[PDB]
């Protein structure tokens, strides 16, 4: 009598493989969310078809698979629009800015697949990159020392060509007050604390500076940029957000 707008499954772990920019690949584990819009004659028993599709490929699911996975999905469930989601930790081995001392840093990356009007596919990637931010307010009023916090710059990007996930990470890291390292030597901490003090940005200043970089990248069709402070002196969170379609 009434059409179901969407059916799907969520909260389902499964091993995945992701390629490094520095030639190679990471073997990690992703949380999944799959669904299909306006399924026809959907019998409630067919819910386990999602799990089928997810297991029918490899032991470790590649991003390459997103093509057939979505194709199988929409056909096996008689809809013409589908959606997949793959959220996983991703590691970069960063070099301390002065010492060169390497240490791993983790980012929450999520790849999002989409298929509409029968066969029209579209890829989107999202990164939650952790940065340190000093706000220029404290810098101005207080004579010595300015308060800083941990921040999360989230960038989601509707892509039209290939982009390394590392590139989008860098855009955020470059644009922040300062980037996080994980292991800091004595000379390193001297650097980053002064580097951040000499480069203070408000929550809106970061999102603005990122948006501006993303406006000009021709591989990006649409984007959402959000940064949020986990306030060092307030116990709440402030956020700013920009979103544009091209």
């Amino acid at each position: 009598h009434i059409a179901i707008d969407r059916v799907g499954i969520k909260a389902i772990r499964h091993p995945v493989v992701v390629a490094d920019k520095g030639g190679g690949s990471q073997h990690t584990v992703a949380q999944f969310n799959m669904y299909v819009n306006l399924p026809h004659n959907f019998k409630g028993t067919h819910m386990s078809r999602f799990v089928e599709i997810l297991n029918s490929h490899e032991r470790e699911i590649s991003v390459e698979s997103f093509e057939e996975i979505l194709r199988s999905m929409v056909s096996r469930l008689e809809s013409d629009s589908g959606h997949i989601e793959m959220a996983f930790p991703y590691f970069i081995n960063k070099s301390a800015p002065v010492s060169g001392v390497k240490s791993l840093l983790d980012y929450e990356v999520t790849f999002i697949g989409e298929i509409k009007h029968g066969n029209q596919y579209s890829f989107t990637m999202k990164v939650i990159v952790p940065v340190t931010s000093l706000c220029p307010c404290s810098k101005k009023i207080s004579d010595y020392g300015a308060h800083n916090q941990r921040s999360h710059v989230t960038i989601s990007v509707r892509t039209n060509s290939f982009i390394w996930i590392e590139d989008i990470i860098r855009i955020a890291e470059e644009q922040a007050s300062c980037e996080l390292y994980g292991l800091l030597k004595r000379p390193d901490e001297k650097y980053v604390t002064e580097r951040a003090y000499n480069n203070p940005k408000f929550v809106e200043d970061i999102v603005r500076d990122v948006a501006e970089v993303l406006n000009h990248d021709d591989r990006i069709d649409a984007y959402i940029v959000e940064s949020e402070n986990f306030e060092s002196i307030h116990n709440h969170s402030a956020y700013a957000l920009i979103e544009r379609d091209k």
Copy 2:
């Protein structure tokens, strides 16, 4: 140079007051999310104005306050569209279906305020009501015993008149395989287990039956209905969803 689409704060507790249908009111605590779209000449220092507005009213914030709060918000931050959110636990003292033995049940209720084009206000309420659901699949194939699970029927409703939060709860509870009670006597458990067995519904069947009730309520302009199983025999979650505007 580039317009900020939105700025706001989130993750901020504050005591609240909510009226019972059975004359009275609950004194509880809500998590908040406030923001404003397209603020003009927004100085990063003005972020603490949200906290001001939140504290400038009562010790316990009432739903009544949503009017001035949003009005203050959009003016104090020079935007013409704002948004508030108030998520809290809500309690009903339910009577065991056979025994009449009373016990409390908690629901995650969230009130959402909106103000657009200068002064046009709009209210939305959302409830995550816990139900038990037996799926008619097991009922059919297995000779004895059918597997059931805990489910979450989420109903969000763009309202155009007053609705008791209890009413929307009931719509969900009536439409489920069976409702949750919290305290069951021997005769009660005999009832509810058989009641659910004789009333099995798939995840799509529940959302369909709820949507149908909501289509005809003239106090409801738009709605989202979602139910999801925390699968007893699968370790993942299946969900179905319906959404309509009138």
Copy 3:
């Protein structure tokens, strides 16, 4: 054949009432955890007796009730040692240090009841108080600006007399680099940023300074003190901990 060491229920919301130091009381909502050690002839059906006991008192449970609740618990379940737990948000209306501008601050308080060897009761309270902390490392090496973060000073205290929860909060807040306020005016932020810069403490320095205050309070029989940084420049958490019995 084999004795069950403990049975209990957890994850159960219920409205509660807590008295303010500044005469009055807060009406909020607590998460519960109840259990009993070495129950005799425990039939699995008796699990719903916990819910009974929890509902058999008031609509809003008081700390006073902990006496009979535990007494009922151990008797109704034939054990001689029981345990209750009551975790809730708690609010203090703080005055900005220079302006006097009042704003609410929330703390995660948890009251813990214990009854052993038949009838020997014992009370314990725990507070997770949010503070800002500057570590004297950055202060030393970098010429200008020192990095700070949000910290959680957790104090749990086996009490032998009455203590206001506010007092234990203060002990933590006084001993921190600086305390959190929620709403800061221009003169206020000037103060707190300099106040913290002139009072830097490592994670171990805070726990040490708190422990020392608690050693001499004769109302405290045993304590656990823990502080942890949500590292502004590292993406992990460091913690220090002290624990003593008297």
Copy 4:
């Protein structure tokens, strides 16, 4: 003046490698918790030594490494007792009980290292295995259909020889009402629903039956067994627990 009882870091992701029983190894990602008891002359700057130790080994940390890691830890921080923790998802490709249809199932495994009195090492592993449980209460009173739920059997084991993590998983899975599969065909669901109905166990019955198996394994020095229901008809959680040292 006052001795710090422990210092450490927590909440830190890092890639790991774990061997399969069916010859091989899983490449996944673990959350870490490291600490050292009673460190001498601990300077607050030395906190980043934990991160050093964690990065100084491989890109993917093996369980083998736990020896030197703990040895480095206690020496580099001048204490004689240390502790490491490694929590990660672990996958088994299970065969549907009737069909043989393979699908992955994830378990939350955590390896725990300990080093005391200078050099005395000790290994502990913990598994949170998801099972379905029917309680014999509903089976008895209601004429048709008995209510079941998802359950978590947690087994932590102080080991004195090598044990496959898969073995401990099986102990739990065998002892449950029925085990979870992830993908069920029509004949499979017919089986498992009847299999669980003909094998009902209370929360205490499961922990008792597991404890009994673990009492007789000579590779196990001490254990904690806990199962908890996510109540299908109650909205809270019941749990039972057993713990013994040998």
